[PDB]
């Protein structure tokens, strides 16, 4: 195995798990969510109003009160992802997320956000330890 | 050495280098900047308008045309930093940056931004591989 | 016969652009996918300054809007211009006025400026790129 | 593979020429501009206010009164270009353009625009026949 | 015969009458009346055309199909300070201000002003509107 | 016929040429040229008249005395998609879009669009503008 | 003189009473009363006429047909600081501020101010409003 | 009757000429001319009086002292669609639109529209403005 | 003196009590109570009078007929930092800030501040409000 | 003696005169005149106090030191529709609208309206302003 | 060290009680609220419009008409608290409060406020004597 | 003597708060640091919703504004209220009106609401916390 092919595989490994995380969010599967996220997950994101939050407590609200409750359609597009492999057990993904969705008044709309996720493999499982979202 | 004290030291290691990076930016020292940044540095930041940029090319403009040129005072404050140690050679810092500065019309002002920097130690030197800034 | 040749090809590109727009208005995704290249790229307002692979991105508007709509709309194509770029390539630029009826009862117009790039593969014209501003 | 390498080369051909066109615009070289553009160039762009213009007449103004005038720095970045090769003599490039520049108030700013250029090779030279720009 | 002046008065009145009839047909949503008074090649500049020149017969269909016909709501049109240029035996041109009193969605009554030019061509004894320019809002 | 279509083409071009000359006269601030091409009874709807119909010769004097003649700053006018209605031997009508590139107060170059109607009347062998309707921001 | 000052007072009062009666007719939606008090040639400058001078009798019909009549919502009109110019035996002129308290769509009560001029002409022993200028 | 229609025309013209002369006096900043044409008891509703009725002669002094005089910047006034009501031998009333072309602070030329009412009273053979209502 | 300071304190409290009662009457929509505490010549500057001085008894009738009496919705008034000027045996003056907590149209609770002056005149043993100045958003 | 009515007229005029003198002292930036006419315990509600009641003598010093004194620029004050309440031999109260014509920074002349209440107390033969309420803008 | 552990304990004491106060407010328990607050509590807060209020009277309204009324979910997060121990019987806490909640339009939203509470222990019970809230 | 005691301590806190404000207005940082606890924390508008260690954060305003300023300013303290929290602790809440002169010539007012918490250590009152809204 060349290190080029090796690097491609690892990079794909991080894309797949990032995509699964996003699926768990969209479906409102908090058990899947907690399984993929490190319990010490920290987050910068618009809803946290410029503060760094412990993501596991702060995100419970969106699952209890929105994401599981919805059956309205939403299509997520991940654009131009870039993965930094930082040794055997650490990685980092930066990507643009376009989300098509339907608004309360019925119309369909799009939103863009720019997202960073930092990944740590512990005991054979990749876990998200940090998340930065802007939009 | 307990792993608690060990972890504290590594965490401090990342704070010091993040602070030095910020000093190099404020002074407009691009040579210091390039020494601390990985050549493959990627960045999400307000000036990149929602796109991911190769940070070394995109940042040259701010050094050539602003940061070295200035002697106007600026005080940076780093608030509530949080460091994730992700194995021997990988780390990640999230912090709030308050910058006090003087505006073109003379008045002093403050700006807040929320910042993530991902770090990789290669050949004994810590290098910044990703940067996410919102504000 | 050289000039008349050019006229014909130009009209060929207008007809197919017009059919594409009919497919969109009727919410016919099968017609749409038959006229669009599977690798279609798009710049457009709903993509928020990004270039998208148009076939995945457009599915949403067919599933959730264009097919479930009984409301009248009249499209007007203004001042089209066609560049014939060899036997198998062309390019159309036009203004699109759309008359429609809005939420609060009333009728409105929107203008957009549109570029479509065309490629003939195995005798069928296919849209490979689309740029929309408005 | 060689089918593939061929395609890669053509695609790079169109990127190089697009980049050269942009250099000509930034430097205010109208002679270089007119050499790279088809005389029948059409344009959709923000300054044309929703109209399609014949780009060679409409663009003269910006060369005469702006682009040739300026020694103010500007860095252009081309992000995520995509090229469609549409046969031996036709191609098409879509890209995002970020422009770093300096404003009247003194300060540096960024602008994004999304750009389509359509290309036609006539007598061995690639010429831009259509241009669609959106932004601001 | 008649005074050159009284002749001119007559013609001018002719163009006012026909312009007024056109406006009635529009208000009543009478498309057949409308098409009878408009040249099939009518061109139009108007707010709803967003700065473009449109072939008025296709572009106006939409407002008859979806608004003007189907309306029960009262509207009073006032034509202010019309001016007619008689441009030979078979050509004329009218410029006028149109105030429209009407009732709005939230119930209330409102006024709108628009400034309007209509160019007229008599073909086979019948005056037809060939161009229309409307500005307002 | 072959001869007739060609005749119509020529008259249409006649009206474009004179409209273009009128625009040159305005750009250059040549009021004498302007008054020679305009009917003394010219009426105008235009943004600077604020919804009113004005007698154009008096109203336009101000812009010639205080702006158009004084001006050394560059301006490029583009006429888009003109359409001419020939309304008999002595009457015509042109509708066009005018893009004007120009340089502003803070130094920068800008564009403005306006949609324009001019009505024409040939008197004693000379085409004269009798009405003008201009709409734009 | 003393009995010319009292004479002037009376005439001024005459013009206030008739102006007040006109306003009552408007508030009640009584168009017959309105047309009896207004000259058929009444001209009007007012906010609903959009900067134009209108023949008031045709233009006001709309507000009687479609609003002032079918109203039963309360409204209190206050006339502040009236001033009357007596311009000979048969002509006068009143300038006044009108405050109107009323109830809005949201159910809330509101006030509006307008400044009003009415010009009066006595023809055949009856005072008639010939002109009206309202701003607000 | 025929010679009452011509009589009416003349009087109406009389009122336009004097209104035009008043405006000339205002544009030139001639306060002496102004006070000769206005009744000392002139009242005024106008935008600069902020919804209040002012005694026009004291309130207008400020604009003559501080503006209309020391002006040499060009201004072209157009009076559109005047309408005159003759209210007996000694009273009249004019309603008109005033377009004013002028040059602004930035150096640019601009237009303003205002709708104006002037009420006139002839005392001792001279027409005097007793009331003024301006909106815009 | 000891007795004098105490005298002044009592009169000041007299003026606060009656101001508070006036405010109760307004909140409850009791117009008879209101008219008993107000001088019939009461003048008022207040936001709803739009910069004008009004005769308060006529102007305030509207708010009693159409709002204050109809109202079942809760409101808490807070009077902050009152200041009383005793201006002789029969005249006084109170300035205070009024915070009003209340519930709005979209259901939510809100606060409004206003700054208020009331001038008082004792006639025949009864304090009456003769002037009122209210300022606030 | 004098008519109860003529007596009342006199007193009312007394309060207008003194209010006018206060306004002149303010316009001229005469602080010594100002302090002579104002009670040392003067309280004020006014726009510059941002909804607070201030002790007017300390708060107004700033405008005399830094503005009203040092001004050469013309200003015409108009007092409209004053109303005076005579509240016994030694107490009064005036409500009036103040229109101020003035010249602005960018050169131009402007008007401002404010609605004003002044409460007056005669002590030792001299009328002194004890309270001031100003609303506007 | 034990000097230090002592300080840590007191600081936690003040966090627990502050958190309990916030629970009482969210649940709309006024009885619990009045037990934790000094009767002389003063407050600076957005709803008091720049004024200092006696918090016990002013806060009654929100309990009567809002907080006790609601079964709509809300999650409060206290970020980066800082406690000053100011002697045996006085303390002071500064913290950021993020509140996740659901709005009228249906949607969930966040609000930040910065909060200071000053504490006084009287007869063995900690009481809030002052409160300063900034935000929105 | 119990009530009079309370009055005195309350006035003690007003005087020192007033001195603090004088130090700020004059740009006297040495006076400022002598009256402020080195661990002073602050909530204030220029901190953008964050809690800052006031001694580092305030240095900038002294270095670049408060000392280099000859322009007049009048501070008014309205309706102060002092809570005495034992022998060594107190707390003051007040409204601060500041009259000042602005860039384009003119004079203006600003209001802010201010809390300062005080701790007496070794006989000297020190500000430990500061909350400013406006």
């Amino acid at each position: 195995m060349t290190e080029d092919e090796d690097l491609k595989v690892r990079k794909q490994e991080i894309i797949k798990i990032t995509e699964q995380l996003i699926e768990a969010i969209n479906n409102g599967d908090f058990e899947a969510y907690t399984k993929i996220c490190d319990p010490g997950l920290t987050s910068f994101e618009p809803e946290a109003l410029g503060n760094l939050v412990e993501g596991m407590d702060f995100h419970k609200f969106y699952f209890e009160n929105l994401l599981s409750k919805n059956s309205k359609p939403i299509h997520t597009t991940i654009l131009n992802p870039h993965v930094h492999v930082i040794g055997e057990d650490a990685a980092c993904i930066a990507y643009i997320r376009l989300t098509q969705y339907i608004d309360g008044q019925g119309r369909p709309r799009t939103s863009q956000s720019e997202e960073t996720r930092v990944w740590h493999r512990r005991d054979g499982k990749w876990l998200n330890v940090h998340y930065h979202c802007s939009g």
Side-chain angles (χ1 to χ4, degrees), chain A residues 1-7 9-15 17-30 32-34 36-59 61-68 70-104 106 108 110-124 126-135:
Chain A
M1 174 164 31
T2 310
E3 68 184 67
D4 301 284
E5 219 246 74
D6 186 330
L7 194 64
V9 148
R10 290 163 183 286
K11 288 193 179 211
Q12 197 44 231
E13 216 160 305
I14 304 298
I15 290 178
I17 196 145
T18 305
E19 293 175 346
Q20 290 169 31
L21 186 41
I22 301 182
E23 190 58 14
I25 297 165
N26 289 4
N27 299 345
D29 193 355
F30 188 65
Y33 189 69
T34 24
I36 298 172
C37 298
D38 192 88
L41 169 75
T42 54
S43 168
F44 277 134
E45 67 187 284
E47 292 296 294
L49 300 177
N51 300 282
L52 184 70
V53 293
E54 310 296 332
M56 294 314 308
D57 174 77
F58 194 69
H59 290 198
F61 192 85
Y62 300 109
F63 281 88
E64 293 140 21
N65 294 287
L66 199 80
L67 295 161
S68 28
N70 113 301
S71 56
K72 278 208 292 171
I74 100 174
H75 192 59
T76 294
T77 297
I78 287 182
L79 280 175
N80 296 322
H82 193 284
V83 176
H84 289 276
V85 169
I86 302 158
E88 314 267 28
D89 295 332
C92 175
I93 192 170
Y95 61 91
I96 293 175
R97 194 169 54 42
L98 286 187
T99 301
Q100 294 163 296
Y101 68 89
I102 295 90
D103 79 355
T110 304
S111 94
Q112 170 173 347
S113 76
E114 305 87 54
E115 283 170 291
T116 296
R117 290 198 194 267
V118 185
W119 292 98
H120 180 220
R121 167 154 66 199
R122 193 219 303 140
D123 272 75
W126 285 108
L127 297 156
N128 187 201
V129 297
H130 181 63
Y131 169 58
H132 200 152
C133 170
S134 43

